[PDB]
């Protein structure tokens, strides 16, 4: 087996009171990939956060309510490594990754670049920048699995209405062609529309009653992995849970198995 | 003989340097620039000089109609 | 295989093609040759012979 | 040469109702009206044109002797 | 040229050994070898359904046969 | 071709190889013979495979 | 053959003995040089020759840039 | 109105069944499917014409040793498929499993270890058991329902065997196997069809040669045809006849509301 | 009504094999098991209903003689 | 109303008339009328094959028929 | 009920107009009606067939009338 | 009579606005509504075409046009 | 009676202007929102006024679930 | 009518999904909400409503 789970909590502190730490704990997963932390690494470190038998590893922002990122693993990584070099991403944590044998996760968390035009600039520049770290990532050994939410959709399979959207951030022209190029291009897959080419799975709605009876969902979650690991994908699933996060939990499973 | 339209289409292609998106029967989109071409083999010029085989390649889908 | 083919593209019949990939594509033969079926459908989408699973036409022929 | 194109002649002349299965696995139903060194015709509601490269088995639903 | 596959396939027919071809999708095929010919074998599942060599990948017999 | 020195020095030498198929499960034996047409694996079962599905043969010792 | 740009093209990789990424059909990567080639198979050396199919090989992505 | 009657019997070798006159009650009995586990012999013992029942078709795979076990299994009606082995050496080596497909159903037949000759038995049976765990939890992932017809040599609950005080030590109710088939049961949320349509006590299936263990009717219910709960709705009803013990296990009787077709 | 409902009680009581025909012209095969005075129940391996204003003809694969 | 309907199906069973119905979907259907009823007619081919009224577009004659 | 059509039909089948009538199905159809009634029509070409007016479209007169 | 459709039509016809009619099948009828009554439609163009309304599938005027 | 679900369905789609995504029997596919309808005709508001027969219509897809 | 009623409403008590297939070819599957002489809806991604006279054959899942 080989688990991994990817929940953006938009604030640990909220999962925490949505029952996200009683759900993880129950959840049997060897990796769990949780975003915007909004909070310090001190306060991460309260036992509360430490799920019982896994590992507790977390990079603050400059700023704890900018961002944050954290993880947790079953078993003790080889090497834990935070920040790409980017401003963008330094100043913020928005990046930390662990290092298993053979596979070496990481934690991506890109700006919602939604709530002004700053926000889309930065998200431009993060994305031309990380374009250019993983062209430079290219013929490195070590295949990796980037469980981030991207705040882009790829295709109109991953969003309704998107006539109405294509103007709104997260569907723009140069976000999808970016991201069709980071994928195809650079040969880089996804493990969900691999294993199930399916519809109307969507992680990140409108916390609005309305959109949930409607369920207008935007895909923003993505578990861009190497094109070593694309053929060990057993499936991908997004349990519809009540209302525990914005971003529904992304678990997915894989044939290979892990090792120190 | 073999390539009687696959040979026109392709050298087409190359001369007016279409930006063409080849998808391969693995379902990998390939999107770039068609430099050269021969029997079994595309030359890709983008980031990365890439080179592709005819037998891996499902369909190519130029952005503009030639 | 020729005459088939030859006569689905000067009929004009509306033709779906399932690669062996799965994909479902759909357009109208434009020309075809030994290891190439031009596909019209808004562009040029050329197609292998050796990547063509089934070839579904609208209507029989 | 001696086993397929005698295997596939009985099952046109027969008529049997065939299940066909391609490389990728997915399954297809219809008789045999002519074959081809390189291809076949499956009449199944529609003519379906289906190339030798993709084909996986040829299941019969029907037990059949070679002459 | 092909003198290899041909005595293996033919020694795997005569004695009857229960094969099982794991085809190039990762599915089972266990079955005798009825026959075999150009770019055809014949399995002697209650269907004897005709596979294509271009789409089978590996023969395993269940028990190790002598060559 | 390069095939037949590499298969037959693998053969004399009965290296445990390492082989790859298409569909990409990571087989395991020694190489019996071999020809154009197929290859005869030395595994405990000994499981023939047709040249033509065939991705890349590794020995697992230098 | 009746072309042969993929002759050319193996030749200037040998001979400088680039760095190649030969990308597969079912989509491992293999890292290596080029050591020799036919018309059915390439021999990559890293510490270990592999014996990698020429129709089993997607793309080759050297990440060396080859002038030519 | 639409009915399927499975029949299963571990024969403990076809030619002790043959001698008590199975295949006459089993050519009498015309069912859909009946199932004789521990053939006891090569499929080229099973071959003789015999064994063959009219109007069904024989397939058998045979463990490495004639007399190790192998499994039978007759239908009245053309399988789509049938297919042995399971990966592993304990099952591969001696035959303990056969399949055969129809159509959105595959009616498999099981043959545990009996486990009560030597310890070495109840090892395998241990290590199998696992493997047969690991098996279902890899196999009941791809989309099929399942009709386990297997003699599992273990009583689930002591409702499956009287005087279990004096059993507790003995195979078939030790710690191990109750827990393994309680996890099987319901952490997988596997049922089983006779104690779903009668919760009866009493009901049994092996007995012991002993025959005053007859007699007074201390018997196991070892055989159980643990089925995916999307067609355990579908059970009519179960019985075990108390006729004359065929076989070391007695006549597992169920009638289905689902119909098989090929 | 003279004709119809002699023709239905004889195939239902008789059991013989149709074949169904829809109004775009695809050829449906299974038993019946029951008919109405505007649907019929159409079984095959799992009972279908069948809509009259659906079917173009109704061809009995043998032949039956009306009462 | 329904006045020409009657002598008309009377006059074509009664010669036994081969009528090329064109069903809806294209198809030609040749043989002669066996019976007719409220929305129901009866065929005389190969087999008594039922054809329902409301999908029948043209029921042609082919030889000269008066009434 | 039928206030148009059967003067129309009667006004057509007295001045022998020659009518071509399309099906749904697109068949083509030609002949002038020689008589109708409330369901089917007589035609008068060579066959002189039934034809049903459920499955008729359109009938378009060779010359308009009144 | 009808609560809207007689009205409807009457409106059509009164303003004599260019309609289109489609086929259910879907080829389209240029020409306005000359006259209407249940179950016909007539046409006004290069000739006294008459349509049907049970054949009839949508009626799109060329201008919004309100009861 | 024959108008106990439709109706009150219908008209409270109406009322709450929902995006509507009509289909019609030979498949194309029209939207907009339906403002009025009786019995036997069905009215559609969107940049070109259109009138709908009911006979001709399959399905009715509305944008949101309406209870 | 005498048998259409009572299937249909054990095709709803019972909680199985109906598919349906248009006269053209075009198959939807989902469970009937409620029925009426001219109309049913099936549930699917939006309260889809189906006129009776448009479906041609009804095949239960089970």
Request: aromatic residues 12%; proline residues 5%; hydrophobic residues 40%.
């Amino acid at each position: 087996a080989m688990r991994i789970i990817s929940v953006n909590v938009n604030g640990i502190q909220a999962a925490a009171e949505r029952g996200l730490l009683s759900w993880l704990q129950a959840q049997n997963a060897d990796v769990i990939c949780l975003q915007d932390t909004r909070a310090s690494a001190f306060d991460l470190d309260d036992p509360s956060f430490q799920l019982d038998g896994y590992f507790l590893y977390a990079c603050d922002a400059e700023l704890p309510e900018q961002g944050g990122v954290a993880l947790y693993s079953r078993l003790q990584p080889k090497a834990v490594i935070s920040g790409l070099g980017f401003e963008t991403a330094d100043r913020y944590g928005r990046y930390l990754q662990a290092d298993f044998d053979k596979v070496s996760i990481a934690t991506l968390l890109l700006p919602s670049g939604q709530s002004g035009d700053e926000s889309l600039n930065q998200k431009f520049k993060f994305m031309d920048d990380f374009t250019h770290y993983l062209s430079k990532q290219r013929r490195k050994r070590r295949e990796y699995i980037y469980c981030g939410s991207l705040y882009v959709a790829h295709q109109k399979m991953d969003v309704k209405n998107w006539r109405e959207c294509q103007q709104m951030p997260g569907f723009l022209a140069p976000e999808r062609a970016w991201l069709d190029e980071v994928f195809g291009n650079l040969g880089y897959a996804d493990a969900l529309r691999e294993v199930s080419r399916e519809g109307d799975q969507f992680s990140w709605w409108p916390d609005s009653e309305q959109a949930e009876m409607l369920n207008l969902g935007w895909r923003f979650d993505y578990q861009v992995l190497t094109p070593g690991l694309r053929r060990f994908v057993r499936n991908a699933k997004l349990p519809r849970q009540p209302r525990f996060s914005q971003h529904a939990p992304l678990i997915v499973d894989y044939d290979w198995q892990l090792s120190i | 003989k073999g390539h009687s339209l696959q040979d026109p289409y392709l050298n087409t292609l190359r001369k007016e340097r279409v930006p063409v998106s080849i998808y391969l029967v693995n379902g990998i989109k390939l999107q770039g620039q068609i430099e050269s071409f021969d029997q079994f083999v595309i030359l890709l010029k983008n980031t990365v000089s890439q080179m592709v085989y005819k037998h891996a390649i499902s369909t190519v889908v130029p952005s503009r109609p030639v």
